Design a protein around this ligand. Structure first.
Ligand code: HEM
Ligand code: CL
Ligand code: CL
Length: 154
């Protein structure tokens, strides 16, 4: 699909709040992902030893990865649909090395939306959540298209 400039601004206005503390947002989002869909944690050989929420919260390496993930996602969002360059290496690594299905990308999208809804009601009302959903749908659509080009089922 194609987002309007108005929709991109709702996206960027809540992302500006995320950037006050991306490490804290990253922790919340990965922990939510793992709690709501435990099967996703099994894709991280580096983190699947983390047994509880408390262990996850105290993991500096998990925190580090959350900052890496949200900073990569933020760079894609800021391109406002012109994100082919950002998507190529991400798609290749997640298709061929990590083996991450599109359904799992849907799971983390859900986790992102849940955490933004929880932390930022002032910037994440119905219209803004709609715009974020649209942006994440666009991201997943384009990743899916790359997966097909790369030979991966998704
Ligand atoms: C918003 C969606 C996501 C973004 C932007 C993202 C971004 C990244 C980035 C930038 C890296 C490091 C560079 C690389 O290997 O490509 C990475 C690594 C990785 N990601 Fe993703 N990721 C996303 C979703 C997921 C999901 C849903 C899973 C699986 C449940 C996943 C599993 C992994 C794994 C296993 C690694 C290697 C981690 C390690 O052992 O160091 N990612 N991701
Ligand atoms: Cl600001
Ligand atoms: Cl901390």
């Amino acid at each position: 699909m194609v987002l309007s400039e108005g929709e991109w601004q709702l996206v960027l206005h809540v992302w500006a709040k995320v950037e006050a503390d991306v490490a804290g947002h990253g922790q919340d989002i990965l922990i939510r992902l793992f709690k709501s869909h435990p099967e996703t944690l099994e894709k991280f050989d580096r983190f699947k030893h983390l047994k509880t929420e408390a262990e996850m919260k105290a993991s500096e390496d998990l925190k580090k990865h959350g900052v890496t993930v949200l900073t990569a996602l933020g760079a894609i969002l800021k391109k406002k649909g012109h994100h082919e360059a950002e998507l190529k290496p991400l798609a290749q690594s997640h298709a061929t090395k990590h083996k991450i299905p599109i359904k799992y990308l849907e799971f983390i999208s859900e986790a992102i939306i849940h955490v933004l809804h929880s932390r930022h009601p002032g910037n994440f009302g119905a219209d803004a959540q709609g715009a974020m959903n649209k942006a994440l749908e666009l991201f997943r659509k384009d990743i899916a298209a790359k997966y097909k080009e790369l030979g991966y089922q998704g």
